[PDB]
Structures are given as structure tokens and as C-alpha cells.
Amino acid sequence: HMASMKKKGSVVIVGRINLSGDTAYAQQTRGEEGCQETSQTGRDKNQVEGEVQIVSTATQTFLATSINGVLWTVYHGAGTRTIASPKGPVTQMYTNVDKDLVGWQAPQGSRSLTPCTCGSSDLYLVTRHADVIPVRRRGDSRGSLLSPRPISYLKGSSGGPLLCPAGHAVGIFRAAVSTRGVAKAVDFIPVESLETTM
Numbered sequence: 001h002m003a004s005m006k007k008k009g010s011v012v013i014v015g016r017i018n019l020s021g022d023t024a025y026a027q028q029t030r031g032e033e034g035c036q037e038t039s040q041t042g043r044d045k046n047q048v049e050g051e052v053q054i055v056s057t058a059t060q061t062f063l064a065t066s067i068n069g070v071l072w073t074v075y076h077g078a079g080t081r082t083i084a085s086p087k088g089p090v091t092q093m094y095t096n097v098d099k100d101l102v103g104w105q106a107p108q109g110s111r112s113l114t115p116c117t118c119g120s121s122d123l124y125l126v127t128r129h130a131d132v133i134p135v136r137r138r139g140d141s142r143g144s145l146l147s148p149r150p151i152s153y154l155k156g157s158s159g160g161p162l163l164c165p166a167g168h169a170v171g172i173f174r175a176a177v178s179t180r181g182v183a184k185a186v187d188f189i190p191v192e193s194l195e196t197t198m
């Protein structure tokens with residue numbers, strides 16, 4: 001019935017991957033109860049910092065990455081949802097189900113990565129656990145893990161960046177290619193596909 005129809009909450013920033021120093025580490029900035037309230041109101045007054053955010057809905061958690069002033073993530077995590085912000089829910093500025101891609105304006109206080117123009121195939125995937133995983137680029141949207149590991153270790157890191165040696169954004173992690181549960185390769189949205197969408 002129309003009177004009873006519910007509304008999905010906003011995506012909420014709950015933490016970040018700190019890459020500012022010599023050591024990468026995950027930081028939590030909001031716990032589960034506060035995340036639930038913030039998702040319902042869409043009002044998040046917490047200060048945002050950094051390039052890689054940890055984000056959550058009521059049912060999923062994943063990453064989002066700021067590149068060129070846009071906070072990018074995956075459609076299979078965010079759907080068409082707003083993101084919470086100090087002034088309330090912010091509507092997506094980009095949505096492309098065909099690429100598994102969404103984006104919102106980057107939050108005030110975030111730092112954006114620069115799109116890579118290096119043409120390098122020696123990449124680094126940053127996970128929600130702040131693992132920095134060497135990946136050899138194998139195509140426009142594929143890379144192979146130099147050290148394979150169970151898909152468990154990658155779960156929840158969609159939306160995270162692949163970086164070049166110089167720290168530029170090369171792509172957004174989308175899916176894991178697995179054999180008997182072991183991730184040998186990753187599928188990602190290249191930054192040129194983002195720069196086209198822009």
C-alpha cells in the first residue's frame with residue numbers, strides 16, 4: 001500500500017583507508033548504530049578526509065574512491081541510493097548499470113586522486129583492510145594478482161582503487177575472477193571509462 005511504502009536509506013561513510021603516511025591502515029569513523037541512524041536521516045556531520053572511503057548501507061559494506069572531484073563506487077553496492085552529507089541526502093551525479101558504476105560529488109574535505117596518464121601496467125589494489133596488493137594489468141579492465149588469495153580477502157573492497165606506481169587512479173575495483181575460491185585476477189572500471197562518463 002502506498003501509505004506503507006518504505007524508502008531505502010542513504011549510503012553512509014563509516015571510515016577511510018589512510019594512505020597519508022608510510023603505513024596504510026583502515027580507520028573507522030562511525031559505528032553500526034550511528035551508521036543506521038545516518039542512513040535513515042541522510043545527515044552526516046562527520047568530517048571527511050582522504051581518498052578512499054569505507055561506506056555502508058543497512059545491508060552491505062564496500063569502498064568508494066574520490067577521483068577528479070567525484071566519489072565513485074559500484075552500482076551493485078550503492079544501487080541508485082543517495083549518500084549522506086552534512087546538509088542531507090545527495091543524489092548521484094553519475095549512474096551506469098552497464099559499467100556497474102555510480103558517483104556522487106566528492107564530499108567536502110575529501111582528497112581526490114588524479115587520473116593516471118602513465119600507461120603503466122604495474123598496479124596496486126587498495127582493499128578495505130588497507131592491504132596494498134600488487135596487480136599486473138592484463139587488459140583494459142583486468143589485472144592479475146601477483147600473489148593470489150581467497151576471494152574472502154577481497155570481499156567488501158569493490159569501489160576501491162587500482163593505483164599506478166606514482167599513486168594515480170587507474171581504475172575502480174569491480175569484481176574478482178576466481179578458481180576454486182582463489183582470486184587470481186580482478187575486473188575493474190578503468191579511469192578512462194570514468195573520464196568518458198564525466
Ligand SMILES: COc1ccc2nc(C)c(O[C@@H]3C[C@H]4C(=O)N[C@]5(C(=O)NS(=O)(=O)C6(C)CC6)C[C@H]5/C=C\CCCCC[C@H](NC(=O)O[C@H](C)C(F)(F)F)C(=O)N4C3)nc2c1
Nearest residue numbers: 060061062076077100151154155156157158174175176187
Ligand atoms: C545489480 O546491478 C549490477 C550491475 C553490474 C554488475 N557488474 C558485475 C561485474 C557484478 O558482479 C557481482 C558483484 C561482484 C562482487 O562481488 N564485487 C566485489 C566485492 O567486494 N563486492 S562487495 O563490496 O562485497 C558487495 C557485494 C557489497 C558490494 C569485488 C568482489 C569481491 C570478492 C568476489 C566475491 C565473489 C563474487 C565474484 C564475482 N565475480 C564476477 O562476477 O566475475 C566476473 C567473471 C567478472 F566478469 F565480473 F569479472 C564478483 O566479484 N561480483 C558479482 N554485479 C553487478 C550488479
Ligand SMILES: [Zn+2]
Nearest residue numbers: 116118164168
Ligand atoms: Zn600514473
